[PDB]
């Protein structure tokens, strides 16, 4: 196993930004191998107390192989920064996909559902959980197949929260949001929320305010546009549970006759 530095690669053009990630697409010198570099400072990191969540993020998602979860080769680090060597996605992402598109057919729909349920199936299997399943942390291979990436989130079930709550709540359940112990149920309500969202063009609980996104989510409420058909409503109606064990598993999801009907992809 190499110990790599900055000096090994080229830098590129930006790829994206997170709350801590600046994302650079890079080449390695000697192979000429293409590759994502994500750049973490070292000072934000001890700011924020996150260190545990880098370490998880690494230590989870090196481990991992599957052809629906992004890579991560390695990592090194300098007197200011923390660099972690990802597979680089050149289709993007599927926020960006969604922005473009203002929503998806039934079929994109579904086939995107397929490999998200495969993924999170995978990753159940050693009870990790992802915990923040949203469109801007999927990301499209070059057969334009979904990967789940950013497992800076992730942990194994069951879990408590010591971590605050920074931005949106959009695609959070009850239990977590309430700061109530949760387990590997959470990923399944985001599931429902990401559904919804991808046929509608926006999140079911959406508001102008996190007091009353709070609210909406803590509540269930939400309603349909005319054109949702029934059998995307009763999928997304089964997810959205406000009782975890209700939620189904991901075996039925996979199942589940509107995804058999519409996606172009199998378990
Ligand atoms: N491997 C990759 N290939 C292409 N783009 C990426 C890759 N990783 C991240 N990005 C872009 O950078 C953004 C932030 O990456 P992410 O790891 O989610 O940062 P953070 O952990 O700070 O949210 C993503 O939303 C995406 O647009
Ligand atoms: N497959 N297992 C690995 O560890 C692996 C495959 C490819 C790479 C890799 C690592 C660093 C750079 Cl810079 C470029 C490629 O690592
Ligand atoms: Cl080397
Ligand atoms: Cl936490
Ligand atoms: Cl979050
Ligand atoms: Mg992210
Ligand atoms: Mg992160």
């Known amino acids: 196993k190499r110990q790599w530095a900055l000096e090994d690669f080229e830098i590129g053009r930006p790829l994206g930004k997170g709350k801590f990630g600046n994302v650079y697409l890079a080449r390695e010198k000697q192979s ?3 590759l994502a570099l994500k750049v973490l400072f070292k000072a934000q990191l001890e700011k924020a107390g996150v260190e545990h969540q880098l370490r998880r993020e690494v230590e989870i998602q090196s ?5 629906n ?11 200011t920064r923390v660099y972690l060597i990802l597979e680089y996605a050149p289709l993007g992402t599927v926020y960006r996909e969604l922005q473009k598109l203002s929503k998806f057919d039934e079929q994109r729909t579904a086939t995107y559902i397929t490999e998200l349920a495969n993924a999170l199936s995978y990753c159940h299997s050693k009870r990790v959980i992802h915990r923040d399943i949203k469109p801007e942390n999927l990301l499209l291979g070059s057969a334009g ?6 497992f800076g989130w992730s942990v194994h079930a069951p ?14 359940p009850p239990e977590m949001i309430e700061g ?6 959470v990923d399944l309500w985001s599931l429902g929320v990401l559904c919804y969202e991808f046929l509608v063009g926006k999140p079911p609980f959406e508001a102008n305010t996190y007091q009353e996104t709070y609210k909406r989510i803590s509540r269930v409420e939400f309603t349909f546009p005319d054109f949702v ?19 189904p598993m991901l075996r039925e999801v996979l199942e589940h006759p509107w995804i058999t009907a519409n996606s172009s992809k199998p378990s």
């Open 180 to 185: 109530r112990m949760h387990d590997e149920k």
């Open 145 to 150: 197949e979904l990967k789940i990436a950013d």
């Open 159 to 172: 879990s408590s929260r010591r971590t605050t709550l920074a931005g949106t709540l959009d695609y959070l």
């Open 63 to 67: 481990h991992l192989r599957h052809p």
């Open 69 to 79: 979860i992004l890579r991560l080769y390695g990592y090194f680090h300098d007197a």
């Open 229 to 247: 058909t029934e059998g995307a409503r009763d999928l997304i109606s089964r997810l959205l549970k406000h009782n975890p064990s209700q939620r």
């Open 32 to 34: 000429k191998f293409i």
